[PDB]
Amino acid sequence: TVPSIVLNDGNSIPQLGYGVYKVPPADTQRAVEEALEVGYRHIDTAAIYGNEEGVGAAIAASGIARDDLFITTKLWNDRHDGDEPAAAIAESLAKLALDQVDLYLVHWPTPAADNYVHAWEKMIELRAAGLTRSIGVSNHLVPHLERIVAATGVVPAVNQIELHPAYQQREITDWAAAHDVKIESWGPLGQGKYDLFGAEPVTAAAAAHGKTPAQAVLRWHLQKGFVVFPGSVRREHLEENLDVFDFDLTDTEIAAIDAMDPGDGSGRVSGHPDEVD
Ligand SMILES: NC(=O)c1ccc[n+]([C@@H]2O[C@H](COP(=O)([O-])OP(=O)(O)OC[C@H]3O[C@@H](n4cnc5c(N)ncnc54)[C@H](O)[C@@H]3O)[C@@H](O)[C@H]2O)c1
């Protein structure tokens, strides 16, 4: 059993899902079929991942009822302009072989291109047309968010950003809570870019519950109310990552993990929105 959370638009989303980022396209179908089998229902993909087909194929292969699944895809940086958003989403839909997706995201803000507002406008139209159930963004900074909302009056259901113990983007998460936008933690486990599992706050919490560090970290995101979809191809980790609704961390435990953030942005492991396209 994976609990769901409710969006500002009333739609619900499973709090834990399976992200297929990094999964080679030729292997995505197996990977998803396995997650599916494991009990995963929320699939996180993206057009840029070039593996929507595999996901779609996996879905179809599973006997699974459409309504029981949560499918997320994202709008690539080069499709912000004109009616490209509608073209991009249609392509995605065709790959997934779905009528519509559950959630659709503006992959990156590409501020320098100053087309993220236009993208947002088009996104709204996509939802209106029923191409997607909900809409959100990704990698959007506070100013990005203010601007889109100001321009449209429509608030993203979510903001998918890089988030883990060493790099929390508190300003964003704070803004989100104030605006009722849910947070999707990408790279929830640091992408192996640093010794997260070695962190003492992490080991203390895991040990304190008879869980793994990965599990404890996952629990922290969850408890903080964020949405997670860690990547993994090992069934051992799949099952493991699913086994986190069984327990809960103490406030003290959470607080200790929260202290891991240097507060200077030095804990970042991936690309910054001001730098991507
Ligand atoms: N919005 C964006 O720009 C963006 C960027 C990156 C990823 N995403 C999404 O977020 C998902 C998760 O992030 P990620 O995969 O980049 O990094 P991550 O923090 O999930 O780290 C992934 C790595 O952790 C390992 N992992 C998973 N479970 C583990 C466990 N129990 N024990 C040990 N290792 C374990 C995997 O082997 C994998 O190599 C992706 O699948 C993708 O769908 C979105």
Side-chain angles (χ1 to χ4, degrees), residues 191-219:
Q191 295 163 324
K193 312 199 168 147
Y194 69 97
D195 189 42
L196 169 62
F197 299 155
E200 194 275 337
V202 185
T203 51
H209 289 89
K211 299 279 192 165
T212 67
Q215 286 175 329
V217 168
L218 283 185
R219 190 67 209 168

Short mmCIF file of all heavy atoms in Angstrom, two decimals, residues 191-219:
data_model
loop_
_atom_site.label_atom_id
_atom_site.label_comp_id
_atom_site.label_asym_id
_atom_site.label_seq_id
_atom_site.Cartn_x
_atom_site.Cartn_y
_atom_site.Cartn_z
N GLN A 191 21.39 11.00 -5.88
CA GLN A 191 21.90 10.41 -7.12
C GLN A 191 23.26 9.76 -6.94
O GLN A 191 24.01 9.60 -7.90
CB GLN A 191 22.04 11.48 -8.20
CG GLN A 191 20.69 12.06 -8.63
CD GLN A 191 20.85 13.37 -9.36
OE1 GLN A 191 21.73 14.18 -9.03
NE2 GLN A 191 20.00 13.58 -10.36
N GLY A 192 23.56 9.42 -5.70
CA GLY A 192 24.81 8.80 -5.34
C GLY A 192 25.99 9.76 -5.45
O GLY A 192 27.15 9.36 -5.36
N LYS A 193 25.69 11.02 -5.63
CA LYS A 193 26.74 11.98 -5.77
C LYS A 193 27.50 12.31 -4.51
O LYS A 193 28.57 12.92 -4.57
CB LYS A 193 26.32 13.15 -6.60
CG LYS A 193 25.65 12.66 -7.87
CD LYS A 193 25.63 13.72 -8.94
CE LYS A 193 25.26 13.20 -10.31
NZ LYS A 193 24.50 14.20 -11.09
N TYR A 194 26.99 11.88 -3.38
CA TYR A 194 27.69 12.11 -2.14
C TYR A 194 27.34 11.08 -1.10
O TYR A 194 26.39 10.31 -1.28
CB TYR A 194 27.56 13.53 -1.60
CG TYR A 194 26.17 13.82 -1.14
CD1 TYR A 194 25.82 13.71 0.21
CD2 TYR A 194 25.18 14.17 -2.05
CE1 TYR A 194 24.52 13.99 0.64
CE2 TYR A 194 23.88 14.46 -1.64
CZ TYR A 194 23.55 14.36 -0.29
OH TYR A 194 22.27 14.64 0.13
N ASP A 195 28.12 11.05 -0.03
CA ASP A 195 27.89 10.10 1.03
C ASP A 195 26.73 10.50 1.90
O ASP A 195 26.91 11.04 2.99
CB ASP A 195 29.15 9.85 1.88
CG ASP A 195 28.95 8.70 2.83
OD1 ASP A 195 28.40 7.65 2.52
OD2 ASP A 195 29.39 8.96 4.04
N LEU A 196 25.55 10.24 1.39
CA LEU A 196 24.36 10.57 2.11
C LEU A 196 24.04 9.47 3.12
O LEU A 196 23.70 9.74 4.27
CB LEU A 196 23.19 10.84 1.12
CG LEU A 196 21.81 10.94 1.77
CD1 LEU A 196 21.78 12.11 2.74
CD2 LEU A 196 20.73 11.11 0.70
N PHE A 197 24.18 8.23 2.67
CA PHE A 197 23.90 7.06 3.49
C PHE A 197 24.84 6.93 4.68
O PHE A 197 24.61 6.14 5.59
CB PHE A 197 23.89 5.77 2.65
CG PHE A 197 22.82 5.79 1.59
CD1 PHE A 197 22.93 5.01 0.43
CD2 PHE A 197 21.69 6.60 1.74
CE1 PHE A 197 21.95 5.02 -0.55
CE2 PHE A 197 20.69 6.63 0.77
CZ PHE A 197 20.83 5.84 -0.38
N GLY A 198 25.92 7.70 4.64
CA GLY A 198 26.92 7.69 5.69
C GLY A 198 26.65 8.74 6.73
O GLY A 198 27.23 8.73 7.81
N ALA A 199 25.75 9.67 6.37
CA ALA A 199 25.36 10.74 7.27
C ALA A 199 24.88 10.12 8.56
O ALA A 199 24.11 9.15 8.55
CB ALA A 199 24.29 11.61 6.63
N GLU A 200 25.34 10.66 9.67
CA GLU A 200 24.97 10.14 10.97
C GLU A 200 23.51 10.27 11.34
O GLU A 200 22.93 9.40 11.98
CB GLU A 200 25.91 10.63 12.09
CG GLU A 200 25.75 9.84 13.40
CD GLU A 200 24.63 10.36 14.25
OE1 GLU A 200 24.21 11.50 14.18
OE2 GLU A 200 24.17 9.46 15.09
N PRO A 201 22.91 11.38 10.95
CA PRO A 201 21.51 11.59 11.25
C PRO A 201 20.70 10.54 10.53
O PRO A 201 19.66 10.08 11.00
CB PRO A 201 21.19 12.98 10.73
CG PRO A 201 22.52 13.72 10.62
CD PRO A 201 23.59 12.66 10.61
N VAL A 202 21.22 10.16 9.39
CA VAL A 202 20.60 9.16 8.56
C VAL A 202 20.73 7.77 9.18
O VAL A 202 19.75 7.03 9.28
CB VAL A 202 21.21 9.19 7.17
CG1 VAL A 202 20.50 8.22 6.25
CG2 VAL A 202 21.15 10.61 6.60
N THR A 203 21.94 7.42 9.58
CA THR A 203 22.16 6.11 10.17
C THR A 203 21.43 5.94 11.48
O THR A 203 20.91 4.87 11.80
CB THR A 203 23.66 5.82 10.33
OG1 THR A 203 24.28 6.91 10.99
CG2 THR A 203 24.29 5.62 8.95
N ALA A 204 21.40 7.01 12.26
CA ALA A 204 20.74 7.00 13.55
C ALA A 204 19.24 6.73 13.44
O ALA A 204 18.67 5.97 14.21
CB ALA A 204 21.05 8.25 14.35
N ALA A 205 18.61 7.35 12.45
CA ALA A 205 17.19 7.18 12.21
C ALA A 205 16.84 5.79 11.67
O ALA A 205 15.85 5.17 12.08
CB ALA A 205 16.66 8.26 11.28
N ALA A 206 17.67 5.31 10.73
CA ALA A 206 17.47 4.00 10.11
C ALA A 206 17.61 2.89 11.13
O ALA A 206 16.77 2.00 11.23
CB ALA A 206 18.43 3.81 8.95
N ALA A 207 18.69 2.97 11.88
CA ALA A 207 18.98 2.00 12.91
C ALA A 207 17.89 2.05 13.96
O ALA A 207 17.46 1.03 14.48
CB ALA A 207 20.33 2.29 13.55
N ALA A 208 17.45 3.27 14.26
CA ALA A 208 16.42 3.48 15.25
C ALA A 208 15.10 2.86 14.86
O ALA A 208 14.18 2.80 15.68
CB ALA A 208 16.24 4.97 15.52
N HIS A 209 14.99 2.41 13.61
CA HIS A 209 13.74 1.84 13.15
C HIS A 209 13.89 0.49 12.47
O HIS A 209 12.92 -0.10 12.02
CB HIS A 209 12.99 2.84 12.25
CG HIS A 209 12.43 3.98 13.05
ND1 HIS A 209 13.16 5.14 13.29
CD2 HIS A 209 11.23 4.10 13.66
CE1 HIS A 209 12.39 5.93 14.03
NE2 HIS A 209 11.22 5.34 14.27
N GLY A 210 15.12 -0.01 12.39
CA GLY A 210 15.35 -1.28 11.75
C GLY A 210 15.14 -1.14 10.25
O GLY A 210 14.60 -2.03 9.58
N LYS A 211 15.58 0.00 9.73
CA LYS A 211 15.46 0.30 8.33
C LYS A 211 16.80 0.68 7.74
O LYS A 211 17.76 0.89 8.46
CB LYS A 211 14.45 1.44 8.10
CG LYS A 211 13.04 1.12 8.60
CD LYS A 211 12.23 0.27 7.61
CE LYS A 211 10.75 0.18 7.95
NZ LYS A 211 9.92 -0.34 6.83
N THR A 212 16.85 0.78 6.42
CA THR A 212 18.07 1.19 5.77
C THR A 212 18.12 2.69 5.71
O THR A 212 17.11 3.37 5.90
CB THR A 212 18.20 0.64 4.34
OG1 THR A 212 17.21 1.22 3.51
CG2 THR A 212 18.04 -0.88 4.34
N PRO A 213 19.30 3.20 5.43
CA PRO A 213 19.48 4.62 5.31
C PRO A 213 18.60 5.17 4.21
O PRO A 213 17.90 6.16 4.43
CB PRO A 213 20.96 4.84 5.04
CG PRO A 213 21.66 3.55 5.44
CD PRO A 213 20.59 2.48 5.56
N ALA A 214 18.61 4.50 3.04
CA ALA A 214 17.79 4.91 1.91
C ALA A 214 16.35 5.08 2.36
O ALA A 214 15.70 6.10 2.09
CB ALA A 214 17.85 3.86 0.80
N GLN A 215 15.88 4.08 3.09
CA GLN A 215 14.53 4.09 3.61
C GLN A 215 14.26 5.26 4.55
O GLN A 215 13.21 5.89 4.47
CB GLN A 215 14.17 2.75 4.27
CG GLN A 215 13.93 1.64 3.23
CD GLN A 215 13.69 0.30 3.88
OE1 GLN A 215 14.23 0.02 4.96
NE2 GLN A 215 12.87 -0.54 3.24
N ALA A 216 15.23 5.53 5.43
CA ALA A 216 15.10 6.62 6.38
C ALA A 216 15.04 7.95 5.66
O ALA A 216 14.29 8.85 6.03
CB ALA A 216 16.23 6.60 7.41
N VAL A 217 15.85 8.07 4.61
CA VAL A 217 15.89 9.29 3.81
C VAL A 217 14.56 9.49 3.09
O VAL A 217 13.99 10.58 3.07
CB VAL A 217 17.05 9.28 2.81
CG1 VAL A 217 16.90 10.42 1.80
CG2 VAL A 217 18.38 9.42 3.54
N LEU A 218 14.08 8.40 2.52
CA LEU A 218 12.81 8.43 1.84
C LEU A 218 11.70 8.87 2.79
O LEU A 218 10.86 9.70 2.45
CB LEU A 218 12.47 7.06 1.20
CG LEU A 218 13.23 6.77 -0.09
CD1 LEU A 218 12.73 5.47 -0.70
CD2 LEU A 218 13.04 7.91 -1.09
N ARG A 219 11.71 8.31 4.01
CA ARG A 219 10.72 8.61 5.04
C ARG A 219 10.69 10.10 5.40
O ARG A 219 9.64 10.69 5.63
CB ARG A 219 10.93 7.73 6.28
CG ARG A 219 9.82 7.82 7.30
CD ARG A 219 8.50 7.24 6.80
NE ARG A 219 7.38 7.90 7.43
CZ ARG A 219 6.14 7.78 7.02
NH1 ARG A 219 5.82 7.01 5.99
NH2 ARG A 219 5.18 8.43 7.67
#
